[PDB]
Structure formats: structure tokens, C-alpha cells
């Protein structure tokens, strides 16, 4: 029955910075703080740690993947799940210390995974796939899926899910790799995949769409041109014409794992091509982040709502200057809608608030580049602008994921943000997940 | 949470003579390729902080400590120190992994620099040395070197007391731990110590006009007998520090609730020991050994058999392993033949595996940096008087190294033998300065 | 005569018999330490 | 003479004293694991 | 409160072969006068309630139980039962005393009557028998006798389960414990059992046409060989109960968290055992014994050496002590020579003291009621094949007795040997029916 | 840190039966109840247990003496002190179980002793005397004295007291063997002895006196006859003319034993020849019982008061029908005052109360006989009458002491009284201390 | 020769050496059980 | 022949294995008495 040190007590799962009088981008990250690292690194030049997932409530939940044979051979892999708490050191130094940990080494392959912090432990939603995507989209059956939890007891239990009846309309199905959220007794996982052509869940998603545009730029393309693309986007070429729809799954947290699954596929009127993403609850406000894998790069956060066991997404917040770099003409600066799949997962943690409770600004680490996945940088962002920053490295640095969660310490009253990133460097090493710690500061004063 | 005792799978497997055969050929035993287990020794959180100088020891509890420096591994003037207490476990699928059940990081201003851990019934004992200045400077000092005896308990709390060094160490200009693990024997912790002596002190003059000369197997020195006897004498006062005698010592503090209790230094005759250097006091089964780093002219790995009297230990003519070398600068290099004055070389643990029923040592395991001069290309293998086994390379790239520390246990349930070999490696794949707990399975030939 | 040869046990059976009574006692002690509440 | 056989109790008597003091401890450690409230 | 372990003063002193000498004369060892220690076994609160039928056993924990009857020790129909868990201690001045750290009294309606305690790792185990009717009646029964296996733990809580007697005991008309302590061996409690057998049952017919005849030392029976063989046969079906075979048994329940686990009865051949009676299964050092009360024609104290197979035990030709007698009614009296049918005699424990290195039994300690016929004049002494030591009388008055149970330990610190001998005595000084834990120091002659 | 079972909680140290409408002697003892005996019996025909002392507050304190060589040789003896709690059994049966016990076997002789229950343990006041009384009264020095406590820790500590400065006026000094009482942070012990002729404490007690008479009888003796005796009583012949004055000692209960002794010798205007006795606190009311060792047999209880560290006794309650048997003409029925020493210690526990809070009746076991100490019987008594009864034995029975303490169980609401007696019988044995348990009952209904 | 006679230890020193390692281990276990809080 | 002396290690080697497995336990029981919070 673990829980955080008192200094943190009260400042964990709630709204951090509320100012109207403030100027959001006037907040900036401290240079990178030095704490005790909680994320295991590799024991070998063979195995590599990848695809991190993080969530925190009264407990801090973390999981990542260990592939083998130099980050190849999906066929096999382990999975790491840690359950932990935020502590202050004797000198008051912030550090994360995991109180309970389990590494899944069995022959089965959990591939994508996402963790959530629930009162009963760290819940996890993974998929068991022995094959590549491209083949999985030619699959005549939906993807196998598991739900499991690491109890405070330290014992770990997992219930497999019935993917045929639940997912029947889908050719492939995956967790979003992001964080899962505990809302109204349900664990809410980001999910995605693709679904059978001419299926109840398919047709319902045809003739429904949304086209988002950027701040100062406006697309040259005709609407009979544009609309025909944004149309062409939801069933991108790379994967053969099958439609890829975003989704959210909701299970009940109980001593019985895999209880009462309800899958909510929103309308594509409000939502773009399904990608990886996280679900967040800050205070009373819930959101789904979606990877920029489609034509639109800028950071995406959808305010979401609970209707009983179901869910509905509303008009998403847009953040420019926070951009997944992409292939053309989907790249970081793209104004116009097009069909593509490329991009990267970057967590935009909501930060600055109006008393309105709408969202002034968010903080996360992005990849600064037009096309390639390179040069990770941390900062806070505005509907338009970006703050001063802290670069992860001054040398060439390759990235895959950055997932951020921010918390404040009460007793001292200083705000810090954890942004977990998957980096490839000369100093850090090749495939390495680094729990970067940062503090927030007003500019003048 | 969790119980500070190795999973029963290990009961009977930790801390004993592992492989015992007279007839079999030691070097036919050999390491598997590198295994993948769950990793304990933590890496840094930034591109500044760097982990280094590791120390490890294990009994019923596994103790690990490593230093965390900053500003790109510069500015000694500050650092933290990480001490972890842990257990050897087997997974649900039977996989070996080291899980550390208790840890404390020391962030206070004070700098403990060279530090070594030992596994004692009461916790993890540690012997560090608080030094704000440079080794070169320190040897010019008019005072000894502050030294702490700390411990981490199973209650997860840390304590320590500063040894009174003006008496215990009063004859020394500089006093450091061996960075290699300590060992619990006869109700006391026993740590490696080394440093310089105040010229013409009691403990300095006791050591004058004495020395030891060790020669290699198929190789004999051209140098004139008298020549060597002279240069071999000068080996103990390397020109680096001005020629204060740099001597190997061992300190034994009584392990008890009150730290730093009744410390007694052991300063062996240099008719046995070489020029003092880093090292480890270890026990396998019923016998204890001191490892000395190759910092002097002598290339081959050494274990001086150690016997303990009361508060004092005695050292006997050392074991030697000829294919097991440190690299060194000339004419101290890996191929070094004759005696000489120098300070160079690297810390590589020769953990004993194959034993005679004679209870005499046949062969050892360790990761040696294989190269003549620089410290590069770490490789694990089994070593013997003359020869080394088939090897496991750590990588195919240029990868430098600082320390490697090896200890071998056995999971009894499966009756398979393993070796943990911890390396401080610097690499493209792993990272700039990174500590990797390399795991290996020991195998035979022809099966 | 034909006696020594049955003493091979003192260096054979006997020590191994100690290693057992150790291993089991240790297993006992081990489980017991698992009592941390 | 005759001391040959009389010591062969080395494989009879002592291997017991072991087993006996073994069980004494084991029982005493067992009763202990029951003394935790 | 308090820890259920004998003061360290006793470590190495409890439950072993106490005095071992081949050359010395057993009977030259002998009891001191009666010592004064602090008293454990509690006396009654009224002139009605009366304590009786005591049982004792000790390992690392000391277990004692005695029955509390009412209406002047009449009306079996009701009673309580007192089970105490305790430790051997030494005072500040070094005085020996038994302090009982945990006790429970059983006041529920149910009557456990004949009961015996054993010391097991998990607590004090007890085997009682729930009987509302008379022994004479019970032997006329068409059903077995309800039997409980209870235990008191170190958590001071009591539990029990009724053995299923229609199967286990199905061949018996009446089934009782020996009132003498049980013993823990090979991960099981082993209790003495005795009673009648259903005529012509499987276990009855197995015992027909068989018997044992034991004769005394300097004394030989006049009776014709055939005569004896006949009367010796009839000894097993005493006229008291109508001639159902009254047989000695031992039951072993597995000691575990769940009581009454896997019980297995041992019903030895009557070529070894006499007509069944009260008794105790005891272990001293590496060997185990069964005591049988003298209830048949045989006067001298008996210990059948007991060896345990798996769930079954086997009995070998009994030890005998000729100067150690029960009194008995004729022609069963203390001086009894030949075989005969009868039920008489008394329970007196022969606790083994002097041993051969042969590991064979020389002499024993116990309090015998010294008299031919009635049960009177208890006296403690050391006994031997032929002879008894100098004695310690319990009193100079006419004092009757029911049970005496003796076990001998040694305080190792002082290296002095003691014997606890518990007696149910009836006296002017002590009281009507009173249980007195008599303590004695064992001494030598000529020192 | 022990304490009683809840069923007793609330009913321990407080007033038991309050009725004006009632008739006191209409209450009677149940026959003798059967519980689990807490008082150790002898291990031998040599040693004998004698001189019991009992007290209870939140803890139950008991101590007695073990003499040797067939109840002879004062020279040596042990002392037993038990610390315990009142428990209910599973079937609800009342029993006393001592949770902490210590037997003092050392060469020193604590002779008379009295125990009190204090928040810090069981406090005890004994004397160390190696000689008989008759010789102790020829003593040129006061009697050595000890104060000690059995902690809940089980550890026992004892501080000797300075008898010369404290007791200087006394030739001999002893604890009253009764119970000690905890009042206003002081342990209050009954004490007695005799004091040096012509001493500050002596002369003050000359010319001061009290003469008590019985209910229906009035002495024939002249006052110039009587007054001259009651005079002659305080310095009885047996002991050589030395005056024997009752007394009470008060020590502070603290981690430091033997702290701040203050000895209070009351005036003999209010008090008779000093004897053994107990000090009791029931609810808010305090009392000193005094043995009937002098000319006046009937049960004696003095209401006492605390002035800081000092004490003052008031007019004592009288109970007829409760009579220490005595030698002539001091015997059980004696009307007239005379000088004698004979009698017996019998505890009169206060029971029935007026709302006035004065004392209607008391309960204890007495010895029914004119002269000899024989035939112990339990009952409740009135200023005049006595109840129905329960006899301890129908055979010849010798007694020494009876000390009673009464308590109620709340949960069940039944009142029981423990009367500890020192008996000599054929059934019980020779010198035997038996914790007789009794219940109280209304007569009709 | 002159060898047996130095084996008197196996039945002399040896067993007594077991009794010690028992007694001490037991002392250990004993103290430990004194930990009942 | 020669087996005489070679077993006399009965008074050398094994009396150690005892002392060693002794201390192993003692240390393991000691560390345990430190694990109580």
C-alpha cells in the first residue's frame, strides 16, 4: 500500500500553473536536472530498451520493451513494468524510486503496451503479435490482446481478452503506447489499428472527416482537391487501402482483470487518422493526445468526456512550434492535407490554465527538424509560440519517443516536469530511455 | 519492501569453490556469449552526470556502490555516491537477475572518492575516503586522508563515522581504499587500502631495504641481477609522486552497531607485496585472497593468498595468471619482462573458479582489457597459470575501459555456473561512460 | 583390510551430508526471513 | 587392530548426531516462524 | 508476553542422554532431597474442584496438562482441562524454576478425560478422548470412543478437530490416550493409546494365539510351563471387561497447521507388548521409548525401545527395572512372580539417565510408590536392572498417589543434572488431591 | 502496558452497590466459585506460603512469603510478586491471570510486605529483619526497610530506605502486610512497630487515646478503671512497655524508587494500638483497615484524607458480627478495654453505599470463633448484623489471614468478590493461600 | 601405525565440536526469539 | 597403505567445513535479527 512522500502530497494529479495575467511562453525549462535514474538500461549489445509508457496518480506506473538481436526480431521480446513512488531525499532532492518491479520474460510477445495507475496497481494493455504490421493488415483476424496489472503485493496477473467478439470489425488492433488514464473506475487506453472494409465499424466512418489548418498559413489547394485528400488520408497507401481509425478502450479496474471491456470508436468528423497516443486526466480535465502521424504535425490534444462506459472527443487544442517532423509533403511545416504515414510520438503535458479552465499552454519535449527524427528539445508552448528551451544534446541525436508528465512539490513549492525520451546518442549510447528531469521558471523574477 | 535474502534457488550456490577438478583442463571451461538479464546498476539522468568507479561484494546479500561525478566526469571537487543492497533472484521462467532491494544515494557536499563495499551480516559496509584535492597534490600533503566507514542496513537507513586518521594513518601522506570490494571475515570487515608513506616514518623505515621480484612464465629478463635488484627496489617509490613509498595495506574494522569500531591497519612486508595499488579482499569457500592492481611493472593478474590472524592478516607468495594482463605504458606494458619503476595499468578482477581438492587454486575468471598499452577492448575468459580460454568480446568497436570487477556464483536448482563481471565501459553502443553488469554462463569443452 | 575402502565415505558421503544439512537449514532461515510482514 | 572396525562407526554414529542436531535446529527455527503475531 | 524458549542456561541441556558411563555403578547416582523452586501446576480454588491426571513433555518448549474434576473428584460427567505452554528458566540467583508462558483452560461442556501432551515445533499438541460414560460401560459399547487432537500455540490460541473414529478406531469398543505425554518424531506427534477390541475383528484376530511372558531377576515361577502359557494368554482379556482384548497402540498424527492430520494407528504384536495400559512415548537423544503402565501381572517398570518406520513404529524387547515396582492387588502385587490375568497397578515414569556409549540403557530415574498392594508412600530414586539408589521419600506420613511422571534435564552453565517428577499426591500437608512438581538434583557417591 | 479485559472495564476501582431502599444484610455470598488459581502453592514439605498481600487498579498486584524448614527459620525466606489482569474466558468465566511475575530468592529477608498497584507497576514495601519481634523491640536501632516495584517490563528494581533518619524515633518498623493504595501520586503503605521511650514521636502520643464500645453491650468497668487500661493498652506487656503506634508511609511513584518518603503518625486520640492493616481507595473514598489485635475485636475502617504528602484519619466505622477471635478478656465478644496483643488480620471490603456516600455495609471473610483462629466464613456485614454465609470448610480449619477485594463485571453486570485467605486444612493442605471467589446475590429476587 | 591413536579425535574432539556449533547456533536462535517486541 | 595419513584430514578438513557452515548460518541468523523494523 505505497504512496508518495508528503512534500509531493497534494501536488500530484492536479492543475499546476493557473495564471491569466501571465504570459505562457514566458515560462521555460531549467537545464537538465540530475537525479537517481529509475529506468533500467541494457545488459548487452544485443538487447535494447524501447517504447516507454508512463502514468502516475497515487502511484507511479512505468513500462517499456526490451527487443533482442540488435533491436530486431519482433518475434521475441520482454516487457518491463515498474510500480513506484515520488520521494524527496535527505537533502530534499527529488527522485523517483520504484517500490515494485516485474520483467516479463516469457515466450509470448507483448509488443505495443500502455500503462495506467489505478488504485489496485499498475494496469497495462498490450497486444500479442508475432508478425509485422504490413502482414497484420492483411490479417483475416483481429489482433490478440492482453490486460494485466502489477499489484502492490508485487504479484502480477494478466487476463487475455477476446479479440474476435470485441474487435471483430478490425483487421489489426493495438494499445497506443501512451499512458492509460483512470477515470470513473474505468481504465482508459488509447488504441488503434485498422478495420475490415465494408464493416459495421467501417462504413460508419466513411463520409465523416475533419480538416485542421495552421496558425498564420492557409492552404493553396482547392477544396475539391483538399477534401478529396483528407478523404484519402484515413486509408493511407502504405497499408493497402484499409482504413485506420483511432479508438479508446475502457475496462473496469477490479480484482478480476479484463472485466467489462467497452471499445469507443469516435466519429472521424472530430478525429484524424488513428495513431499512437496517450490519455490524460489533469485535475477534473481529461484528454487524448494523438501522434502527428498524419498530414497534420502540430501537437494534438482532444478534450474527452465520459458517458458511463463510453467516451466522446471534442474539438482538439492545437499547438504550433511543437511539430512531429515528417515526410513530404506532411513535414513539420505542412499547411495542406495529404495522405501519408510518418511522424513521431511526443507527449504535450497540459500546464498553463485560465480560471476558465481552458488550456493556455502545454509542456513536452519535441524533435526540432523539418523531416528527420533528430534533435530533441524541451520547452513550453503556446497556441502559437514556443518558450526558451533546453536541448538534450549539442551533437547529432536520434529520437523515437518523448512522453512527459508534470508534477509539483508542495512543501517547497517548486514545479518539475518528467519527460521520458527514447534517445540514440554517442554519450548516452544507442537505444536508451532517459528520464530527463526539468524545473519550470518565470523569466523575469 | 522485499526480503534481503537470495532466492532459495541460490542456496548453496553463493560464495563457494565452484568447479573442482584435478584432471580436467582449466582453460577448457569458458564463458558463454553475454546473457540478457534485468539490469541493476543505474545509468545517469543527464549528459553531464557520469557513473564510475564501481565496487561489488556478495554473501547472503549483494552490495554494490558506484561514484557519480559531474561536468563530464571532471571536477572531483563534487560527486555523489550510490550504495545499493540487493539479492540474487530467479524469474518465473527461471531467468537469473540481480534485483537490489535497498538503495541510498549520498548527495551531501562531502566527497567520498575511492570507495569499496563489503557484505556483512548487518548490511552493506562501505569504506570511502573524503578528498577534495588531487592525488598528485595529496602526496605532497602534510596530513593523512580523511576516511569514512559507512554502512547501509536492511532497514534502508545509512550511518557512518570518520575514522581518526591522525593516529591510525599518521604515518601516511595519502590513504585510499582499493575501490575493489571489501570482505567479511572473523567478525570484521577487511578492506584494501593503499597510498604513500611519510619518508623515514616508523612504517616507512620498516619497509626500506626490501622488495620482491616476480618473473613471467616462458620469459626471462635480460637485465643484470644487480641491475634488477636496484630497479626493483625503486619500483616502490615511483617518480610520479616524488618517491614516497607507495605501499599496500589492509584495514579491518570490527563490524558492529557502532561504525568505525576498533580499526587496525595491516601493512604487509614488501618482500611479499608489490608497489601498493587498487585491489580487493575476497573469500571463496574456506580461503581468502587479496587482488592487487597491476599498477607496478608486473603484468599478470595477482592473488596473494590471505590468512587472518586476529586483527591482522598475512600474505603469502601470490598466485599469478600469465595470459591475464593489464595494458600498461612502457616499459610496463602487457608484455613486460623485467622489473621497473612506473604507475600505469588497470583494475581487472580474477575471480577464482576451478579449484583443486588440494584447496589450491587452478584457474580464475575475469574480463581483461586485451591490448598492450592503452586500456581498450575488454574480453571475458577463463585464466590459468599459462593460458586463457575461448573468449567473449564485449564489443567489436574501439571501446575503452576503467574498471572490471568479477564474481562468480551458481544457481543450484539448475546446477549451472555463472559469473557477474561489472565493467566501466565507454562505447558508441553503450554510452560515453557506462557501467554494464555483464553476465556469462560457464561452459565446458566436448561437454 | 577392506575397511579403508569403506572409509571413502568420510571424504565422499560425509561432506556432502553436511552440505545438505546446511542447505536445508538455510532454506528454513530463508523462508523465515520472508516473514517481513 | 580392531580399531579398524570400531571407527567405521564414523559412517554410523556421527552421521546421526548431524541429522539430530540438524532437526533440533530446524524444529527450533520452525517454532519461531509460528511466534510471529 | 515472554519468549517460548528455554533460558540459554539450558541450551544443550534439554532432551539428551544425560549421564554416560560404562564403568561407573548406576545406582551410585541418586536424588538430592526435594528442592524448592517456583511452582507452575496450579491448585484448585475450592474444596470441590480437584486437579488430576497430569501429563508432561518437553523439547524447546515445556508442555503440561492436567484434568480438573468436581464434586469431590466424582462425576466424570463434567470436567475442565488445563493445558499450559512453558519454558525452563534460571533466576537472578541461578535458581531453577519452571515458568509457563502460555496457558488455556477448557471450560466448555465437552469432557476430555484421559489426555496427553507432546511438545511440537508448532506448540503444545494434545490428544484427549471425549467420554461421558464409565470405562466399564465403554467396554460394553457398540461404537468407538470420540477422540480430539487439539493444540495450544505460541500465539496463545487453542484449536482442535475430532478424529474420525468410526474408521481409524472402528475395530475398538473403547479407545483412550495413555495419560502420559506424547512425543514429536519424524515430523509427527506420537501418542500412547490403549483400550478394548471388538471380538473377532480384523485387528482382534490378528492378535489371537499370541502373547509374551516376562520373568523377574533372581525369581522364577513355580507354575507349570503349559499352565503359564495358558494364563499368560488370558492376561490380555482381563475378566474386568468381559474378555475383549485390551491392547496397547500408538497413534501418529502429522503435526501441521490443520489438526488431526493423516492419523495412523500402530497396533504392535502382543508377542512384544503386554496387556495394553497407560503410558508415554518418549525420546532421549537419538532413541525413543514407550512406557507401559504395570496394569497387567508384570511389576517392574518397562521401556520398550521404539523405532519409527514411516507412519508406523515398531517395538522391541522391553527394558526392565526390577527394583522399580508398582503396587498391585494379588496375585499381581509388587512381588509378582508368574503370569496372570488382572487389572491393577499405577503409572510411574522411568525417565532414562545413565547411558552406555553402546547407546544402550543402563539406568533410569523415577518416583515409585513403594508398597506391595495399595498405592502409597511415593519415593524417588535411580533404578537399574537389579537395584535402586539411596532414596528421597516424599513424606513420612501415609500419602496415597495416582500418577507420577518424571523427566530429567540438565542446566549446562552449572553442569548440574536435575529431574522433574510430577506426582498426584494426597496428603495431610499438601492436600486432599494435589499435584506437586517435585524437583531433585542428581548426585554421585564418593563424589 | 497491560490492562483488564473490557467486560471488567469501568467496574474495577469504584463503588459497587449503592442502595438506600435496600437492606444491606439482605445481600449474601454465592457458594464458592471455581476459577483458574493464580496463587502458587508449595513445591515441597519444607517451604510454606504465607502473609499474602493484594491490590488492584488498572493492574492487579499480588505478593506473598515463602518460609522454609516447615514454616520456621525467619532467618531465610523468598518473596513472590505477581503483576496481573482480570480476564473473561471464552465461556465468559471470570479468572485472574498474572501477566508478569517475579520471585525474590536472594539471601536477604523481606519479612512483612504490602503491595500497591501504581501506574508504573506493582509497588511493594517490605522490611529486612533477621531477628524475631521480641528481640527487635529491644533493638537499639530502627528496622531496615525496602521499597521496590515490578515493572510492566517484567524487570524488578528496589531501593532501600534510610531507616535511621526517617524512623529514628522507632525501635521497630514494619509494613502492614495489607494492600497499599495509590492516592494523589503517592503510594500509601500501612506501617507499624514501636518507638523509643521518651522520643519526640513518643511523648506526643502520651495523654492521647480513644475508647470504642460495642452495639448492644456497655462495659461495667469504672472510667478511672477503663481509662487507666485503654491507657495501658498502647504499650502492651508482651513487648516490654514500649509503645506500639499505628502509622502510614507515603512515597512518590516515579522511575526513581524510594522517592520523597513522608511518614504520618496520626494522633492516638483517633486511633488504637498499631497493628497490621490495609489502605483502600474505593472510588473517591479512602480508608485504613486496622487489625483487631487490641482489646477491640469488631472490624475497623478509618476514613482517611490526604493533605499533600501527609495523612489524617477520622472516626472509624464499626462492624459487629465481624470479629477477630482473641485471648481473654480481649476475645471476640469483649465489651471492655484492656491491654493485650492477640488477634487476626481480616479484610472488610467496603460495599453498600448511601447516596450520602457514607458506608452501609462491607464484605470480607471472618473467623467464626470466640478465641481460637478457626472456621473462616464469608459474608456481608452491617453496623450491627451479618448476612447469610458461605463456610470455607465443614471440617476443622485453621486460618491466619483473609484479605478481600471486590469488583464488578460491566458487560454481564454481576458482582464478584475475591477474598484471599491463608488456610490450613486436610483437603487444602497445611499452609495454603487460596484465592476464594464469590458472587453477590439479593435474597428475594 | 601411530595414526589410529590420533583418530581418537573422531570419537572425541569431533562430536564435542558438533555439540558446540549446535549450542552456539541455538544461542543465536534463542536470542532472536527474544525479539518478541 | 598411505590411506592412513590421507584420512587424517578428518581432523583437518571437515572440522573446518563445520566451522564454515557454522558461521554461514550464524551470520545469516544475525542479519535476520537486524531485519526487524
Curated annotation (Swiss-Prot), chains C, D, G, H:
It comes from the Viruses. It is found in: Virion membrane; Host cell membrane. Coiled coil: none annotated. Homotetramer; composed of disulfide-linked homodimers. Interacts with F protein trimer. Interacts with host CG-1B; this interaction inhibits viral adsorption and replication rather than internalization. Mediates the viral entry into the host cell together with fusion/F protein. Attaches the virus to sialic acid-containing cell receptors and thereby initiates infection. Binding of HN protein to the receptor induces a conformational change that allows the F protein to trigger virion/cell membranes fusion. Neuraminidase activity ensures the efficient spread of the virus by dissociating the mature virions from the neuraminic acid containing glycoproteins. Belongs to the paramyxoviruses hemagglutinin-neuraminidase family. The C-terminus (head domain) is involved in binding the cellular receptor. This is Hemagglutinin-neuraminidase. It comes from Newcastle disease virus (strain Chicken/Australia-Victoria/32) (NDV). The chain holds residues 79 to 115 of 570 of the full protein.
Amino acid at each position: 500500500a505505497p504512496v508518495h512522500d508528503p512534500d509531493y502530497i497534494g501536488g500530484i494529479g492536479k492543475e499546476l500553473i493557473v495564471d491569466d495575467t501571465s504570459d505562457v511562453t514566458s515560462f521555460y525549462p531549467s537545464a537538465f536536472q540530475e537525479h537517481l535514474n529509475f529506468i533500467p538500461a541494457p545488459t548487452t549489445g544485443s538487447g535494447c530498451t524501447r517504447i516507454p509508457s508512463f502514468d502516475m496518480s497515487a502511484t507511479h506506473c512505468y513500462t517499456h520493451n526490451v527487443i533482442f538481436s540488435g533491436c530486431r526480431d519482433h518475434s521475441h521480446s520482454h516487457q518491463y513494468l515498474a510500480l513506484g513512488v515520488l520521494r524527496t531525499s535527505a537533502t530534499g532532492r527529488v527522485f523517483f524510486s520504484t517500490l515494485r518491479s516485474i520483467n516479463l520474460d516469457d515466450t509470448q510477445n507483448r509488443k505495443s503496451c500502455s500503462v495506467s495507475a489505478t488504485p489496485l496497481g499498475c494496469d497495462m494493455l498490450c497486444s500479442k503479435v508475432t508478425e509485422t504490421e504490413e502482414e497484420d493488415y492483411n490479417s483475416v483476424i483481429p489482433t490478440s490482446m492482453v490486460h494485466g496489472r502489477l499489484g502492490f503485493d508485487g504479484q502480477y496477473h494478466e487476463k487475455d481478452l477476446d479479440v474476435t467478439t470485441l474487435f471483430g470489425d478490425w483487421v489489426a488492433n493495438y494499445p497506443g503506447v501512451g499512458g492509460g488514464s483512470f477515470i470513473d473506475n474505468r481504465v482508459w487506453f488509447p488504441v488503434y489499428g485498422g478495420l475490415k472494409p465494408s464493416s459495421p465499424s467501417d462504413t460508419a466512418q466513411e463520409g465523416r472527416y475533419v480538416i485542421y489548418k495552421r496558425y498564420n498559413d492557409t492552404c493553396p489547394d482547392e477544396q475539391d482537391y483538399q477534401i478529396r485528400m483528407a478523404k484519402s488520408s484515413y486509408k493511407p497507401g502504405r497499408f493497402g487501402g484499409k482504413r485506420v481509425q483511432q479508438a479508446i478502450l475502457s475496462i473496469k479496474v477490479s480484482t478480476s482483470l479484463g472485466e467489462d471491456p467497452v471499445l469507443t470508436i469516435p466519429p472521424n468528423t472530430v478525429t484524424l487518422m488513428g495513431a499512437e497516443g496517450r490519455v490524460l486526466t489533469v485535475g477534473t480535465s481529461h484528454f487524448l493526445y494523438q501522434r502527428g502521424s498524419s498530414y497534420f504535425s502540430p501537437a494534438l490534444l482532444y478534450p474527452m468526456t465520459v458517458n458511463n462506459n463510453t467516451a466522446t472527443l471534442h474539438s482538439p487544442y492545437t499547438f504550433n512550434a511543437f511539430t512531429r517532423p515528417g515526410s513530404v509533403p506532411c513535414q513539420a511545416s505542412a499547411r495542406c492535407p495529404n495522405s501519408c504515414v510518418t511522424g513521431v510520438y511526443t507527449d504535450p503535458y497540459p500546464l498553463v490554465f485560465h480560471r476558465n479552465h481552458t488550456l493556455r499552454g502545454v509542456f513536452g519535449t519535441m524533435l526540432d527538424d523539418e523531416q528527420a527524427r533528430l534533435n530533441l528539445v524541451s520547452a513550453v508552448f503556446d497556441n502559437i509560440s514556443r518558450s526558451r528551451i533546453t536541448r538534450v544534446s549539442s551533437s547529432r541525436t536520434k529520437a523515437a519517443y518523448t512522453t512527459s508528465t508534470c508534477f509539483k512539490v508542495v512543501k517547497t513549492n517548486k514545479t518539475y516536469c518528467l519527460s521520458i525520451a527514447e534517445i540514440s546518442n554517442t554519450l548516452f549510447g544507442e537505444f536508451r530511455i532517459v528520464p530527463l528531469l526539468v524545473e519550470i521558471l518565470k523569466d523575469d523574477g
